[PDB]
Amino acid sequence: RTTRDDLINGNSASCRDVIFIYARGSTETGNLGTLGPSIASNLESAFGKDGVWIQGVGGAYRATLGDAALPRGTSSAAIREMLGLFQQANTKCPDATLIAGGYSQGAALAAASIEDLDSAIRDKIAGTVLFGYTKNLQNRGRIPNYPADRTKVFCNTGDLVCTGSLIVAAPHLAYGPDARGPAPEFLIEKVRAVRGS
């Protein structure tokens, strides 16, 4: 359940209407980690199995704990990997609506990638969810160059990474309920706002 490569494996002749690109947290397994699968199952319920492609950020993104201390909150190699996936989605399925998300180091990776992304592709990301956003204080709860109305941050009280630290405390591991309900609820609402239906 922790590995999904729907975009990479998918046939361009039968593109999904929605493509979700997600970055896992530090030390998590597969390319979806602990929260990704929960969001994925709810997206599948809303758009149908063939209506949405779930794609985790794998490849060069090793989710190494130490990389969270680098300038952008992740490595340059990881940012190149996620940028490449957004570019692949744009090329393979020009008409698909994109949505993204990330947890912990993956949240910093999603923010850094979206910030560097060509505006024409970035503008196709209808909504982005960030859990335990490591650059929450630094970026004042925003993703640079990306609208606030398309952003939803889940930062628990007591989760030190949300207040400028890199210390991992218990609240940082309590995003399960958010991944099962409000996060997919937000993503679904943002997709329907632009796609109708």
Swiss-Prot record:
The protein's use is:
May have promising applications in chemical and textile industries as it is capable of hydrolyzing a variety of substrates including soluble esters and insoluble triglycerides. Can hydrolyze and thus modulate the surface properties of synthetic fibers such as the plastic poly(ethylene terephthalate) (PET), or the textile fibers polyamide 6,6, polyester and acrylic.
Where is this protein primarily located? secreted
Coiled-coil spans are none
Question: Quick one: effect of changing L166A?
Answer: Increases activity on p-nitrophenyl butyrate, poly(ethylene terephthalate) (PET) and polyamide 6,6
UniProt keywords (A-Z) are: Disulfide bond, Glycoprotein, Hydrolase, Secreted, Serine esterase, Signal, Virulence
Role description: Catalyzes the hydrolysis of complex carboxylic polyesters found in the cell wall of plants. Degrades cutin, a macromolecule that forms the structure of the plant cuticle. Allows pathogenic fungi to penetrate through the cuticular barrier into the host plant during the initial stage of fungal infection.
What does the UniProt record report as the effect of altering S26A in this chain?
Severely decreases activity on p-nitrophenyl butyrate
PANTHER family registered for this protein in UniProt: CUTINASE 1-RELATED, CUTINASE 2-RELATED
**Reaction catalyzed:** cutin + H2O = cutin monomers
Query: Any inhibitors or activators noted?
Result: Inhibited by n-undecyl phosphonate (C11Y4). Inhibited by paraoxon.
- Residues the UniProt record annotates as site (Transition state stabilizer): S26, Q105
Which residues are connected by disulfide bridges in this protein?
A: C15-C93, C155-C162
- GO biological process annotations for this chain's record? carbohydrate catabolic process
Record's GO cellular component terms: extracellular region
Across the pH scale, how does activity change?
Optimum pH is 8.
Q: Which family does it belong to?
A: Belongs to the cutinase family.
Source organism's superkingdom? Eukaryota
Mind telling me what this protein is named?
Cutinase 1
Q: Which organism is it from?
A: Fusarium vanettenii
Active site, UniProt feature? S104 (nucleophile), D159, H172 (proton donor/acceptor)
Which molecular-function annotation in GO is an example for this chain? cutinase activity
Query: How is the protein modified post-translationally, according to the record?
Result: The 2 disulfide bonds play a critical role in holding the catalytic residues in juxta-position; reduction of the disulfide bridges results in the complete inactivation of the enzyme. O-glycosylated; contains one mole each of mannose, arabinose, N-acetylglucosamine, and glucuronic acid.
Query: Record's SUPFAM superfamilies?
Result: alpha/beta-Hydrolases (SSF53474)
What's the EC number here? 3.1.1.74
Q: Where in the cell is it found?
A: Secreted
